Symmetry: D2
Subunit: 296 residues, 4 copies
Amino acid sequence: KNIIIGAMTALITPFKNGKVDEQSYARLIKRQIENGIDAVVPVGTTGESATLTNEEHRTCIEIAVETCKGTKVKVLAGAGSNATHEAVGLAKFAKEHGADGILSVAPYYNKPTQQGLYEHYKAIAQSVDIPVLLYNVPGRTGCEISTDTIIKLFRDCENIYGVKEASGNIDKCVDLLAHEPRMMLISGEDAINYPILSNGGKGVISVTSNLLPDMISALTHFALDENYKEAKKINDELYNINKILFCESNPIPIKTAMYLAGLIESLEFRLPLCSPSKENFAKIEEVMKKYKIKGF
Amino acid sequence: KNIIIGAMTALITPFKNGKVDEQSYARLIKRQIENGIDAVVPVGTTGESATLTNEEHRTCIEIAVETCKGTKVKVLAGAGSNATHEAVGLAKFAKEHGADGILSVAPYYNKPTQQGLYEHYKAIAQSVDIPVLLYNVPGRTGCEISTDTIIKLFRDCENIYGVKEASGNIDKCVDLLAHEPRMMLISGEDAINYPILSNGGKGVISVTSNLLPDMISALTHFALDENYKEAKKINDELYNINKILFCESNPIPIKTAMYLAGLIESLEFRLPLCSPSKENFAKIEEVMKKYKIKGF
Amino acid sequence: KNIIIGAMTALITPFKNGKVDEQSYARLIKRQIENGIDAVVPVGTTGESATLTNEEHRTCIEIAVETCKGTKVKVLAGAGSNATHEAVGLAKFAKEHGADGILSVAPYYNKPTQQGLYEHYKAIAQSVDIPVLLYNVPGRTGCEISTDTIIKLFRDCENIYGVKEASGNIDKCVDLLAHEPRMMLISGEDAINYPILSNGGKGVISVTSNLLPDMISALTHFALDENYKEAKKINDELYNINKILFCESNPIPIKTAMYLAGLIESLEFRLPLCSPSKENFAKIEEVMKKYKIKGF
Amino acid sequence: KNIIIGAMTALITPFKNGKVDEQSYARLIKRQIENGIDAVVPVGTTGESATLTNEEHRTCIEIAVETCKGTKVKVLAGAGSNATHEAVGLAKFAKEHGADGILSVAPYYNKPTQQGLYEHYKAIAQSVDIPVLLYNVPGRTGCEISTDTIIKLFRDCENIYGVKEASGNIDKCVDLLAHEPRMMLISGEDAINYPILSNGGKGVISVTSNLLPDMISALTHFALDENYKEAKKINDELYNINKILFCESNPIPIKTAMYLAGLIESLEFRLPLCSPSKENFAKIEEVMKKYKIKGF
Ligand SMILES: [Mg+2]
Ligand SMILES: [Mg+2]
Ligand SMILES: [Mg+2]
Ligand SMILES: [Mg+2]
């Protein structure tokens, strides 16, 4: 199977006067490339996929593909939906814009059955010929892609090559790689990046890497090269920022950090997302002061 | 305040050859009207809002508005979204096409803060001049509208008149009606319809009423007239069907039941929703046999 | 079946210089009797069952039996354990000292199966000839007595006449009384006393009644005679004190309230229970000011 | 600090005709010693701590002390309670009988506050001069020892040297060892033994080692020797048996496994524990079939 692994970044989508800041988006993606990042995830959950239009979805996938062109950096485009017909459309569309693969979240809100999840993802995989990475985040979706459903999908469809897990369940991460050791388990939970990698995980799709791309990539590459003592050291010193970046729902804290670090120009969200509490604003700024934040 | 209360039905949306069966949809809505139902809810979660197009969304709202014309039955249209801009658009659209009010579910998947939930619903409320009923279902949305947020919204925007609760939290319903007894608490959980009504709840938005509208109608009005013994007897008698109508994700069991009762011609869902088990199919069929299901 | 229903109080156990204040204990039970309480629960969870010795267990049961001598107030003695052979000893023993019935908590910590729970309670019921009330509170024990396990015990064992539910699950309270309407459902959660009573519950085992015994008894008997509007009015007015009495683990808040009201002489617990935070201390003093606390 | 780390076994307690099979106990403890175990834990939760008497508590600790005479294998005796005065007593007695250290479970059922938990363990630590290991298992106790409480106890009392964690929370184990890298984190969840060890944990207190002591010992020592390829290899192969050993409450599956393997002589529990369902009984024997169970 063709795969997309390593240190990956769920990119924020900077706004300026209600529109996508196409200059900051490109500037931010070349900052990721210059710090050892292996792939970028445009218009994911961290990029406020829910409040973006279809034309903004296309623009940012295109900017990612073009900014990475020539580099070894891959583009793993966010293309998911709780409607199967729409998920297939978004997958085909992503391929037409030059993405190397798609990240497809489990259908949210409507809670499909395990059988339905299989048929949902099977249709998506047969629409395109590019890698498909599943995204399991039950706290947000209200549903769980079971270990047997993930493995069945991995074995039955070529392009499904693994799953990005955000479930805080290291038991499940042992379960997966013990019954199907060939899949690519990707951490979608920054705080436990090292434990997932040390059990055979082959990458992360990180939120913290928006602010500290150099540290997240070093952590990932240390682990893949089996230097677990140096990988754990970075994971240990990243814990404080890893937790405070979720003091409120992602991506509210990370955009606050990016704005405070001067990497984005305005602290703008699209409703129902908004600026954080005054207390958490100070707590994010305080925790930031103990990390050296790479510039442009 | 303008209100929409009483016995209400979250309508299923029947499909035939992948398209909305517009003639059964109208026939089903007139079956609700003829059995004492006070309002119907088109294109809600039970109506598979997620897999419907904008043009079908409008079609089923129009069919609902058109068939309740001349009757006393109100149309509480489903118009919610995890994007405020679309939720405002969907709300304005419902009013322009004759809906009497909107049911607006809490933003799903994206997890807005309580502050963000306030600004989200405030934008929807200021967009229209028809009643707006909040919908809290944390198991599906991943977020919870706190009691203080609901009460703040009820007091700050007048078209917001209450909340539909599917939370399995009778403590919260005591909390709500003890600190703000003027709001309209609506039961969104058929099994606990009576406890919610007996604490001051003023209506239900039911799933069971799709199959047994006469029984749910009697329950609601018995309770509203404070005949609790006669209301509770129906609630106790409906418990068995109330539970198994959720043996799989709603609306998988109720559509199965409607098909088994012969009220729709095809047992079709749109992926990622699917037909249930062969075993869940048989236990839905068994429990149905202990109830009298009115025909057309 | 012999039953013990109505308004009941989970008695606190006042300490003085590390010993049980035996005269205050009697005085406190006499304040309950004079304010319409129907039964008292010595050596329960609210009475710090865990940190009392067997001889203090006996002393407090005997003081309760002696103080209710001549009155119509029943003694529902706490006699539970997660070791069956000891739970049987405590049940036999409670009867030998004049208790009218026993409240038996579900085995904690060791998490028995439903089969194990069945055999546990069957042994206790066959050990004595006084009414046995099961006590289900999964948040404290780590296990749940299922609806079918409760009903099987009610039908198979003569002495078992109901359950005291502290599970925040009004669905389960519909489940119980719809499939077995002859059992005595007792509310073990003060905030939802009225909803449980309005569904057929026949009494409460209260914590707040330690502070406001007259108000809890008025609520109970209003509800039992069916004046539900009068019962709900008291339950709505009691919500604030009912919640703030659990800002920390029971009985830490209630003992603080009893001390502030001057009903007990010293704010003593046995470790690992301790005095509350400074902030929670102030919050209890706030809420008490909105209620009339009957003296001696 | 003096510590007790490495591969450890939470010993089952075999019964024969309602009595502790003392002879069989010693034979099983010497089977653990002969297979690389570094310490054994008598009368813990796996040993049915709740249903043993105080003198049976003494009997099983003493046999352990006597059977480890002459070996390097330590005795980490279970001596815990939800009553602090009893927890101090059980610790003193455990030391007076020759134990090398204490395992002290968090107070169950009575849910002490974080402040109360600190004073609880401080009393136990100041009671004895042998190592004290904290035990956090919130699913059974109903309480959680916060990370800050664990760290405060580690720094404030000499003999408190770490915590055993059974919380299914790999985030918390990063939290602990990143803010206090000097403590001894011990895994109390067999399925995630390696991830906890791979993050700096220095031992396990196992259930599986009752059945497969050589495999659990090899896993730990490989991990302690930083041979992470071989530690994960064993952990991946043990996942199936590790999970099926909790299809019912521990120690119901492990005692069933020991009986099926012929390592214990009768399948007896003390109520409320009992033999498993036939269905789960068959599932345990099946999963056992892919492992080599060392004899005596
Ligand atoms: Mg596109
Ligand atoms: Mg009309
Ligand atoms: Mg009338
Ligand atoms: Mg409590």
